[PDB]
């Protein structure tokens, strides 16, 4: 991955995530090699939201 | 690895408290403009002190 450092502070920062799902669909496989460095972020994100 | 226990603690502290600030505020019927701007502020250091 290319280091998407973004604290999920603003409830309007969902954008970074939209970035992933759209991309995961648009390039299911490339995204698959990087499922692993992406989860760090979802976790950074899931942490605060849930 | 991942997060802390210290920053993670402050995170639930800001909330329990914030939740508390919420009751007092809805209590003294206040504009949602500031309930939010301020809750937003309270929120910046949850992550900010992370």
Helix (H, G, I), strand (E, B) or coil at B5: coil
Chain breaks after residues in chain B, where C lies over 2.5 Å from next N: none
CA distance B37 to A35: 36
Residue B13 backbone phi and psi in degrees, to 5: -80, -35
Cβ–Cβ under 8 Å, residues B14 and B45: yes
Q: Which residues of A touch B (CB under 8 A)?
A: 7-10, 43, 47-48
Name the residue facing A9 among B2, B3, B43 (closest C-beta): B43
Residue given tokens 């605060």 in the structure block: A48
Solving technique for this entry? cryo-EM
The end-to-end CA distance of chain A, in Å, is 24
CA distance A25 to B2: 28
Question: Which CA distances in Å does A35 have to A43, B14, B42, B50?
Answer: 12, 32, 33, 25
Q: Structure resolution in Å?
A: 3.1
CA distance B36 to B43: 10
Measured in whole angstroms, how far is the alpha carbon of residue A27 from the centre of its chain?
14
Name the residue facing A7 among B3, B40, B47 (closest C-beta): B47
């Amino acid at each position: 991955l290319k280091k998407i450092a973004e604290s999920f502070e603003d409830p309007s920062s969902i954008v970074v995530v939209l970035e992933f799902i759209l991309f995961a669909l648009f390039f299911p496989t490339e995204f698959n090699r990087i499922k692993g460095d992406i989860q760090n972020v979802l976790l950074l994100f899931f942490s605060r939201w849930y | 690895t991942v997060t802390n226990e210290f920053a993670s603690r402050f995170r639930t502290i800001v909330a329990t408290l914030a939740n508390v600030v919420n009751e007092r505020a809805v209590q003294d019927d206040m504009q949602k403009a500031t309930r939010s701007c301020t809750k937003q502020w309270l929120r910046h250091l949850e992550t900010q002190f992370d």
